[PDB]
Amino acid sequence: KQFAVIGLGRFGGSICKELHRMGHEVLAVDINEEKVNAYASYATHAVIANATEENELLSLGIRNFEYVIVAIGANIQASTLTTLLLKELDIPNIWVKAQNYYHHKVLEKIGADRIIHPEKDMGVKIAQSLSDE
Amino acid sequence: KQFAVIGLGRFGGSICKELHRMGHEVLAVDINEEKVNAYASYATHAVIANATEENELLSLGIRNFEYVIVAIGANIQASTLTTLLLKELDIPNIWVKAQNYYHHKVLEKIGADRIIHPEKDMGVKIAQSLSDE
Amino acid sequence: TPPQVLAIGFFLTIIIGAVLLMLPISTTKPLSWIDALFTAASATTVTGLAVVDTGTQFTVFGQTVIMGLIQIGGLGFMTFAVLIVMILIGLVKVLFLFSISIELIAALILSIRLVPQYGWSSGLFASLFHAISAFNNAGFSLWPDNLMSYVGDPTVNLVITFLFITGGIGFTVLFDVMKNRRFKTFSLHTKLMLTGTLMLNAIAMLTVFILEYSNPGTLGHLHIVDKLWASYFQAVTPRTAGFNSLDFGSMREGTIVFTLLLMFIGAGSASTASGIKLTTFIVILTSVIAYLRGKKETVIFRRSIKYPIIIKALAVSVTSLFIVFLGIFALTITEQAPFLQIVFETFSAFGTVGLTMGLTPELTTAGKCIIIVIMFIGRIGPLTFVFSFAKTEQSNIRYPDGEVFTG
Amino acid sequence: TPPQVLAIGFFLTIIIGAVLLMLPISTTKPLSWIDALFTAASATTVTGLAVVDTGTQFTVFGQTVIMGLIQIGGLGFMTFAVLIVMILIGLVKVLFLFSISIELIAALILSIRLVPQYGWSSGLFASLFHAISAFNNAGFSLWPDNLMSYVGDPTVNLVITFLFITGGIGFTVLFDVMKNRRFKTFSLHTKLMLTGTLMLNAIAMLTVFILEYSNPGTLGHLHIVDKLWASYFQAVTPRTAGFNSLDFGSMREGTIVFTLLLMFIGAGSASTASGIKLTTFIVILTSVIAYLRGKKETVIFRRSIKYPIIIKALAVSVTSLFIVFLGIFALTITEQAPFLQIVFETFSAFGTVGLTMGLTPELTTAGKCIIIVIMFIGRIGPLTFVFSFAKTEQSNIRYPDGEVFTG
Ligand SMILES: Nc1ncnc2c1ncn2[C@@H]1O[C@H](COP(=O)(O)OP(=O)(O)O)[C@@H](O)[C@H]1O
Ligand SMILES: Nc1ncnc2c1ncn2[C@@H]1O[C@H](COP(=O)(O)OP(=O)(O)O)[C@@H](O)[C@H]1O
Ligand SMILES: [K+]
Ligand SMILES: [K+]
């Protein structure tokens, strides 16, 4: 019921739209103003903020959210830095989207609860569908 | 008495300041807003406009000015395009600042009354000063 | 031309309506040229100010003409207001069907109360006339006393108030409420109108009840239940229907002063109301409070308001006050009347409310002409009217910044 | 705290001045507590409203205390206004020397006219008192009739008008004129004040002369030369000196209505005047006209005005009107007075002008308290006063844009 998604892109935006359809309260935060306006109606709360600043994260109230999904793409440093800040806020579950194998290793060692690799993870279940078909 | 300077840079800004000291009416036009604000007090009229658009040139009233100095630097296409527009406005005297030898040739053939090469032209008079000294 | 059609269209309607009342079949007694023009202008630019009583001056045919002008004037602006909002006759028929349907059912409810008292013929025309007048925020009444005899009648108060509250808020608000039905999913504008109307009416009802409680002329010689009805009615009628249940001329000056602000802010945007709208007042009020608190942006209902909205809200407010100031200045020179009545008349005329304190009948020929201009400008809107008759040239030259001390 | 010192400082001056007039040496006859507080507040927050005549109530020592409060109040705000402008006691001494020098020479010129009539002792204190009062835009007069006996005296009219015109425009304007001496080299603000004052005074002088020409009470039983002086004086005194040459209570209502706007727009910025200043009125007026003409920016005097200047000008204007509206609303409930006098009193008190029409002496105890608050808030400024007693928290979070219809 209490979910937060950081980064409204192809992967992050899809999570907000799907969660909103199921009837869940989702907080969407993104630096780009156009992304927040587009997903303003698809999220319970839409915020234009920078996730790499610890002062803004406290203003949003991320510590309240049990699940935080960091879906920042094409900016690996922002994704790595955001998750490191979230552990200081003792977030119980942090789900991070990885970009490559090296980024996957860094996120694992800095304390990411679950690492998502949308291109690689989709292949291993498309292949599973082929066997079942 | 009726002078117009286009491009408020190191070369264009120096002309406006020197002419203003001598007591002449100078119109300063530049795309950059910071340059126009800085030279607003050093010019009789300061305008934020683009010299490559023929519609804006007519609004300023360049056809009234007998002498127009095109001091656009680091943007050779803007300098070349501006002087070509000015000849359509039958400007009597057009003084243009050149960037290199190839730009000097192009300006000469498109009808520039006087071509100024500040780096090269200063050398030929510094050398003259050495002989006289 | 896009905003010029509305200005020309209302002008054509007024003159056609004015000459339609000149025939010796609409009015029993002869009517002067200025009064017919004023009556047509008040009906077309739907305000409700009357120099002559509708019942005692016009006949059944004449009252039908007034009913036609109110419906045409109220719907003509309402359709264009919706079109202006969406841009900046498929839709017209939808609004016409909705307006007729709600007015028809309201007349049937009003018929249960009026036809047992006035008769089958008299009670059905009166119910239909008030249903049309109330929904379009007109305030016209066939009876010599404007709803003053039905202060304590729940049927008259509830049905009529529902008509100019539903027709007061914008049609976008009505569409959004029925399409979404969840307050969390309403638009920012819809949430401003629904929340603003409840807060503004509650404050107005409290102010009228407290100030007029001890007044012998109004709200004093009434039962406690009737006091609530009159206070409730007099709080929602200033924006912008202008129906009466108490004599505004015998009210306290403090109530009149508060009514001046109440009828300058009007109601919904794309609707039958006029006057800086409610959202404009809220946008300005919240923008100033944010500036005083140091906020870099205006935030309300978890949203943000951009500078073009802020300046447009502030531009229409100052322009409206300047027009009202000119009207008061013009009327003081022309009319030899008490100042409070002149100010109340000008705000009512500009906001197209129609409330008055013993001044509209006694206006001179020149005074009536000023009110007609004020009513026309207020109905059209200061921004819309200027664009019709102003030369337009989009500038393409920027200038160096200048420092101006506005402290 | 930076704007809180001025609010606290004036409060300390008023209470010190109020108790200083309580001694049985300043006033011949006993003075009530509220009148002394009102007199001190009017002198400190330099407005000129008087519940008791200065000459017939206070003695030479008492009038000296009033003279001290005017000089301290006028210079105290003027120095801080200049400091606020430059930020957003070396300078204080320069302003004090300039203010004393111009007032001293003016008193000497006035002494040529007053001491032949009142005497060496009486004529020198009166000339000095009026020189101090006029330069600081006070309007206090020792004589029972405020300059009404010198309507046609060129020496009194010219010298006194020059004092509150020089002291009315900002000290930045005075510095810029003497430093540059060329209109082409003046700042944008300086060119707005010099051009605006000439245009505004000319329009005001024409309006007063035309409207009051046939009035028997004022401007009617006077010579043609005296009509020009009275019209000229009554056009420049509303902003913001508040000196009199004609009875405002016997003027036409149209003249009073125009005076309401005249003393709302006040005068210059960093000076002894108060009210939305002129530049604010010009900035708003030109910004709206540019919007109506479709201009993307506000351009005046070959310069450009940025949005923060536009919104600040519009924010102070609406805030000032809201405070004036609250004052009129409060006075109507409290004071049982004609509405026109109440409106004129509130605008005069807020603008610290001091002009009145037979209302200040007859105010009740509660009515006087409201005026003191209105005078204090208007002198400090709605924006400056709020910042003193408002919690400040700079926001660092942006929100998605929302669409609001402000039509
Ligand atoms: N520091 C940051 N804080 C919050 N959001 C960010 C930050 N940096 C980037 N983003 C958002 O993350 C999104 C990443 O999208 P993109 O790079 O297109 O890949 P994907 O759509 O797969 O996530 C961008 O839309 C951007 O707005
Ligand atoms: N299209 C244009 N129209 C007018 N002014 C221009 C245009 N393009 C560039 N300029 C101005 O010309 C100036 C050139 O300055 P710069 O490139 O630093 O060399 P210099 O100072 O020697 O002229 C810039 O400051 C710029 O603002
Ligand atoms: K109405
Ligand atoms: K004064």
Cβ atoms within 10 Å, residue D316: 23
Separation of alpha carbons C246 and C224, rounded Å: 15
Q: How far apart are CA D389 and CA C109, in angstroms?
A: 54
Q: Which residues contact B122 (CB under 8 A, 6 or more apart)?
A: none
Closest CA to C334 of C377, C372, C363: C363
**Size of chain B in residues:** 133
Residues D125, D61 contacting (CB under 8 angstroms): no
Chain A, nearest residue to D397 by Cα:
A49
Instruction: Please report which helix (H) or strand (E) contains residue C364, including its range.
Output: none
Q: Can you give the C-alpha Rg of chain B in angstroms?
A: 15
Query: Any idea what DSSP says for residue D310?
Result: H
Give CA–CA dist C342/C345, Å, rounded: 5
Name which of D293, D289, D326, D283 is nearest C319 in CA terms: D289
CB–CB of C392/D294 below 8 Å? yes
Sign, CA torsion A105/A106/A112/A114: negative
Burial class (CB in 10 A: 0-12, 13-18, 19+), D340: buried
A94 labelled ligand-binding: no
Give, for C374, the enclosing helix (H) or strand (E).
helix C365-380
Cα–Cα distance measured from residue D239 to residue D351, given in angstroms and rounded to the nearest whole number: 8
Method: cryo-EM
The whole-angstrom distance between residue C360's C-alpha and the CA centroid of its chain comes to: 17
Give the DSSP letter of residue A111: T
Residue of B nearest to C402 (CA): B37
Resolution in A, one decimal?
Answer: 2.8
Please tell me if the CB atom of residue B6 comes closer than 6 angstroms to any atom of ligand 2: yes
What is the per-residue DSSP string for D134-193? Answer: HHTT----SSSSSSGGGTT-HHHHHHHHHHHHHTTS-HHHHHHHHHH--GGGS-HHHHHH
What contacts 24+ positions apart, CB below 8 Å, involve C231-236?
A: C231/C205, C232/C157, C232/C161, C232/C205, C233/C147, C233/C151, C233/C157, C233/C161, C234/C208, C235/C201, C235/C204, C235/C205, C235/C207, C235/C208, C235/C262, C236/C161, C236/C164, C236/C165, C236/C201, C236/C204, C236/C205
Ligand (nearest to CA of B14): 2
Tokens at residue C41, please?
A: 């202008």
Distance B92 CA to ligand 2 centre (A): 23
Distance CA D13, CA C298 (A): 37
Contact C356, C345 (CB under 8 A): yes
Q: Is the dihedral of CA D138, D142, D145, D150 positive or negative?
A: negative
- C/B Cβ contact: 3+ pairs below 8 Å: yes
Query: B1-117: what CATH class?
Result: alpha beta
List ligand 1's pocket residues with C-beta within 6 A.
Answer: A 6-12, 29-32, 35, 50-52, 71-75, 78
Which residues, by Cβ under 5 Å, contact ligand 4, an ion? D 48, 137, 139, 242, 354
Cβ–Cβ of D397/A56 closer than 8 Å?
yes
* Minimum-distance CB partner of D396 among A40, A46, A56: A56
Q: What angle do CA C388, D290, D205 make, to 5 degrees?
A: 100
Nearest-5° Cα angle at D345, D339 to D351: 135
User: Using an 8 Å Cβ cutoff, are C81 and C137 in contact?
Assistant: no
Q: Which CA distances in Å does C11 have to C61, C64, C365, C380?
A: 22, 20, 19, 11
Rounded CA-CA distance D312/D296 in Å is 18
Provide the chain C residues 360-399 that lie in CB contact (below 8 A) with chain B: 396-399
Report residue A5 CA to chain centroid gap. 5
Do A and B have ≥3 inter-chain CB pairs under 8 A? Answer: no
**Torsions phi, psi of D117, nearest 5?**
-105, -40
Q: Shortest CA distance to C31 belongs to which of C17, C21, C41?
A: C21
Task: Compute, in angstroms, the gap from residue A35 CA to the centroid of ligand 1.
Answer: 9
| Contact D182/B at CB under 8 A | no
Tokens of C188: 């920012």
> Is B13 near ligand 2, meaning CB less than 6 Å away?
no
Cis check: omega of the bond before D240, within 30 degrees of 0 = yes
DSSP for D200-265? Answer: HHHHHHHHHHHHHTT-STTTTSS-HHHHHHHHHHHHHTTTTT---SS-GGGS-HHHHHHHHHHTTS
C-beta separation of D389 from D8 below 8 A: no
> Phi/psi at C27 (nearest 5 deg)?
-115, 135
> Which residue from C minimizes the CA distance to B44?
C400
* Atom 19 in ligand 2: residue holding the nearest Cα: B73
The count of C-alpha atoms lying within 13 angstroms of the C-alpha of D88, restricted to the half-sphere facing its C-beta, is 16
- Closest CA of chain D from A112, distance in Å: 26
Q: Are A3 and A14 in contact (CB under 8 A)?
A: no
Residue type, C270: A
A-chain residues within 8 Å CB-CB of D397?
47-49, 56, 59-60
Q: Please list, residue by residue across B86-113, b when 16 or more beta carbons sit within 10 angstroms of its beta carbon and e when fewer do.
A: beeeebeebbbbbbeeebbebbeeeebb
Tokens of C228: 């609530």
Write the CB contacts of C271 (distance below 8 Å, at least 6 apart in sequence).
C78, C81, C167, C168, C169, C170, C171
Residue to test with chain A: of D397, D401, D403, most A Cβ within 10 A: D397
Min Cα separation D274/chain C (Å): 9
CA distance A108 to A114: 8
